[PDB]
Predict the 3D structure of the following.
Amino acid sequence: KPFSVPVLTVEEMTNSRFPIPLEKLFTGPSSAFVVQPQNGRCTTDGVLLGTTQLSPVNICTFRGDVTHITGSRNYTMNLASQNWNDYDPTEEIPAPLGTPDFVGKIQGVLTQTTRTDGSTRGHKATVYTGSADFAPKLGRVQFETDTDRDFEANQNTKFTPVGVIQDGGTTHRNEPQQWVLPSYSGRNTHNVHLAPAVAPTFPGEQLLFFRSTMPGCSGYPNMDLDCLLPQEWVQYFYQEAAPAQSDVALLRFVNPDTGRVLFECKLHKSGYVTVAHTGQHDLVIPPNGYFRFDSWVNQFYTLAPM
Amino acid sequence: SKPFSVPVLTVEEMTNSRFPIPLEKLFTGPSSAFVVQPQNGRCTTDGVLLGTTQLSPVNICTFRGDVTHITGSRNYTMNLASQNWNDYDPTEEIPAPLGTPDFVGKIQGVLTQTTRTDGSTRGHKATVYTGSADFAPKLGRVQFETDTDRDFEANQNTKFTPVGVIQDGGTTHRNEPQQWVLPSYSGRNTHNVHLAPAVAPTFPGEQLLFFRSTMPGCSGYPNMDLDCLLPQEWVQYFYQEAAPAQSDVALLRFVNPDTGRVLFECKLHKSGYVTVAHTGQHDLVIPPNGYFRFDSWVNQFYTLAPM
Ligand SMILES: CC(=O)N[C@@H]1[C@@H](O[C@@H]2O[C@@H](C)[C@@H](O)[C@@H](O)[C@@H]2O)[C@H](O[C@@H]2O[C@H](CO)[C@H](O)[C@H](O)[C@H]2O)[C@@H](CO)O[C@@H]1O
Ligand SMILES: CC(=O)N[C@@H]1[C@@H](O[C@@H]2O[C@@H](C)[C@@H](O)[C@@H](O)[C@@H]2O)[C@H](O[C@@H]2O[C@H](CO)[C@H](O)[C@H](O)[C@H]2O)[C@@H](CO)O[C@@H]1O
């Protein structure tokens, strides 16, 4: 079975790290920090990595039951799986699938249904993923809410993410920090089973990022969110499971109107993209442009500069 | 001719095409008593999108645009933009903007906004009543009820993220939303246009097979059932594959890969919906790894074995 990538434009696709559309392509240097996202991680031959799962709507969602931290508006969620089955902390993954993979304050809504009569309720909620009590790998996360009384115990509860916040009395855009992983088991613990950090290895190359802008809900947040693979590429590679014939797939970004190649890039087998560029650059692309797999190449292939 | 197929995905791995939430189960029931004409999750087997259907699972029931405050209230009117912030064209031959809600109800979510000059941001609880006289997305305007009369700015990018549905608990429980009642997309006293057709089983002993989710509820006692005709992933897959239909009916088998055995067969109609041989309302009991597989194109006389 021949390898390929989807015929989808950037704007037709979805971020693999938050449930929002892609907007644009960005490249920049990343040697000064660690790029190790856990969502949007998949090999070209269809092996899921990190905390990656298949639907974009489940990314940064939580489900479980909640208990009230009395004397506060905070609730502890005992996590369940997406289908309400028991969450198993012994599974060899860093955290439940779809767990946020950055340190920040994610605002959304906590909803709940009472099983017996079908009464429902929803409240503004924020999860601080840098919190000592953010421990999704252990099965527990804390939400700050706008109620101290309305949520019931032992009832199905869901967090739907909306956006991110920042404290405007402090330096603008200082949070979130999209490249800082949470400590998934809480303070003084070490992460396990992580998808590896990524970096270009070839001289003159940089990572190519698939970029969105997260909604902001308060203050002056850094809303940039870069994934290594569109969620649709994760979905497609998982479906196709085409064997990799080398460690590097050469892709051309093509303008279907002219048939002209705008740029070429390397799709690495372990699931990220590099380009030949030095410096920060927002790519200018025609909106109907798309990626096309042309050939498997060896470890010595030099990309045309873009 | 490119061979037809459906994705190897379990039900729980897939997504509702009518609200941005996972599928939970398969359901069949009679539908002769009401009109089944959803506009999201509509696609032919050879990949032609229909109704208000588009490819993004996360854009379903989202709105983007700019907002104007309705003086003397906590309500805002959104002037709609396209999903990529381009101008919305009301003359396009579609029922409404792609992804527009396709049922009458009160959808609660959050309106968020960024001020372009300094990156200041804001978010507020918001509800859109899709049965409202001023729900007119086809014309490019929708009204949102919020918890502020002052915080949103004009001429700034504003997004509605859907969360769930509400109901008025002082009235008969589960009386809303009404998932099979289409909104009036151009507002009060208007007629919808360019609709994907209503669907019904035609064959004796057959019913629609529905891909079912439960919408989150945010207040009251809502009817949270939400049935789509196709998983969003099947829309995405047919769009990509564009495999020609060789007849009007694709026979599918629902298979348990753990055992290699067929649990039931069903018909995937070319115009994009599924029927099974069953009478009455029934939640299907399926193994967790079960999935659909294409068997062959059949003629108009093929009879399904009872489900
Ligand atoms: C949801 C809420 O009420 N949040 C407020 C903050 O206001 C939000 O963020 C500011 C920057 C602005 O975008 C508002 O539209 C949002 O509602 C508030 O931040 C201060 O708000 C004032 C204006 O009201 C100034 O713009 C300051 O620069 C902001 O720091 C903070 C602090 O008062 O309180 C809540 O978080
Ligand atoms: C968000 C909010 O406060 N909504 C309330 C309604 O309460 C919600 O809905 C009820 C059914 C329940 O699930 C609450 O936990 C929700 O917060 C409220 O409905 C009444 O709620 C009371 C209990 O507080 C009784 O259950 C009544 O039977 C419900 O009608 C309505 C009416 O008071 O007000 C807000 O919409």
